[PDB]
Amino acid sequence: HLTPEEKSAVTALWGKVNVDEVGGEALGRLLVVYPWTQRFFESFGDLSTPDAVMGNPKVKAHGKKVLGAFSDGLAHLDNLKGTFATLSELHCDKLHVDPENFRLLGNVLVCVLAHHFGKEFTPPVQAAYQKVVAGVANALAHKYH
């Protein structure tokens, strides 16, 4: 549940987001800050140091796909379950990712947005984004419910 003001503030800031770099930074920081997430990405190569993680080309490329799904979600806020149906099935039945990790990635993305926009990422702007990431996490965890 987003108010019309909150919806317009989220959409306005998202149009300024560099998709080619924000995604790679959010995925990279999840692997560095929460090291247990690395076991799901063994086939991505060298993840031994923070510098090796941030410089990994497979991490950067995958990050773009993650942000693409978030963009799709922002275009269909009224129907999040439908927009993430197959992705929920993939993460649950094939990868077996604990749903708590969806909340962690959402929070890391919020940190990355604050880092990229500075004082433009105001407390009301953060409040609306927290509602979005929680909605995305809940829609991804549906096939577990």
Next chain:
Amino acid sequence: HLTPEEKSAVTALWGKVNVDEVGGEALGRLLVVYPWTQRFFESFGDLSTPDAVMGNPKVKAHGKKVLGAFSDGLAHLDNLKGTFATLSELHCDKLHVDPENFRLLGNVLVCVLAHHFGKEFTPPVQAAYQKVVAGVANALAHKYH
């Protein structure tokens, strides 16, 4: 979300449950095991010792109301959101209970059932009850989403 076998096993055991005592024991144990929950129940009286908590008449009376909502949920498993609509609004907007505590109460209830039934509370029986308590916790947290 429950198989016909799981549904019959949950229903059979629930008919044996003493509503007048199981509810009071589940609510009492939440207050003893997770002491921060006591701040929401200050007006209930003496909560100084585990024996004072378990013997408190307001804790016992309130526990019956909690179990009554769970019984209602078991009768409407396909529509949990509708069955808990106003209760979700109450816990969120009026009481401001963090949704993590709904999971804790669900888990404490599972411990109380195992304590009361012993070897009859088998691992497949627990697995079906875990699906139920998770569903109830999720339906109560809807007005936050």
Next chain:
Amino acid sequence: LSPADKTNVKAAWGKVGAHAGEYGAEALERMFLSFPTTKTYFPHFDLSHGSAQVKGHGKKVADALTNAVAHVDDMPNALSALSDLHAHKLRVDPVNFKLLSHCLLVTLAAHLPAEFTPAVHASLDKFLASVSTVLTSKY
């Protein structure tokens, strides 16, 4: 742990005695059925009911917990080797330690009705959360 909690844990574990291994194997079986995501950490294991591998592993878990009860004042040192294994080698998600702790509590409630009082339940939850904190310390 507080002195009241230490006394409750030592008294409850003394009653468990020679059945610790049995309770450990049952707690693992309860975890695999209730939370299927936990099964991915054991692909090399026979996970069927009454498995010899699950019985053998349940004994090892129980032995580690029995050693933690005896070394309650020096838990980080006694469980140091297990922290490296679970966090560095196996990369066990911290949420899974809560799932196993809950299943151990359900197992004890079903086998020790006279011992599983609200006070003892609270102390055993605090002991298992301390064990979980030590096993995830390398994160």
Next chain:
Amino acid sequence: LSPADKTNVKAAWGKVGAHAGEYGAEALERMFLSFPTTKTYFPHFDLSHGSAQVKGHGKKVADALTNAVAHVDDMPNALSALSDLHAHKLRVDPVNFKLLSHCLLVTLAAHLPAEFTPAVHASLDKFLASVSTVLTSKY
């Protein structure tokens, strides 16, 4: 904390300097707006944007964190009085310490772009989780 984490925390907090109080007040404001459940702990407070009470309380939080950085090897002893207040007196739900820690990280990311590297982000998250563990130790 590991030596690498201690060095990262001391270096990042040194750059914060005289602005700690300002960052503390902003982190609280971010928490109240993003997580409205946290507001119930402050009914006696003016919670509007730019509140003198929020500014004053943000300074006290920042002073406690600055003292924790200086006593990084002896955190349970330095923060002992604060544990009794938050757990016994105020009965603060443990989930709220995670919510405030996240809001402090967002505040630092917005004000220190050159300093908030992935390595420093990881160290500050570990430091705030250690502070939270000490403040909830009485549970």
